[PDB]
Amino acid sequence: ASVATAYLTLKADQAQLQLTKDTLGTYQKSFDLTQRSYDVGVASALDLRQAQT
């Protein structure tokens, strides 16, 4: 039982790690777009700061 549950937790953690990698890629794209909007002059610095957080 312990070996089975440990292998299942490993597989579940690997899948959740892939999904958090996708979340990090999405947040990187969104932060780059807000950085472009702030560098152009349309968005203020506060909208950049919240995307940074």
């Binding site: 702030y38 203020s44 610095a45 506060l46």
Partner: protein
């Protein structure tokens, strides 16, 4: 009437007052709108330097 008749007048001398009160009213309204928007533009001019 604000001139003596039969005399010489210079350019820009006021001749008659035509009782404004309406030009006075909408001049006061435009002055109030200017008094709001001018200090708004000044505050935004101050804030735009440090990108607030």
């Amino acid at each position: 009437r604000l001139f003596k008749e039969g005399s010489d007048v210079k350019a820009g001398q006021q001749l008659y007052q035509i009782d404004p009160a309406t030009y006075e009213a909408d001049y006061q309204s435009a002055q109030a709108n200017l008094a709001s928007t001018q200090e708004q533009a000044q505050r935004y001019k101050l804030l735009v330097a440090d990108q607030a």
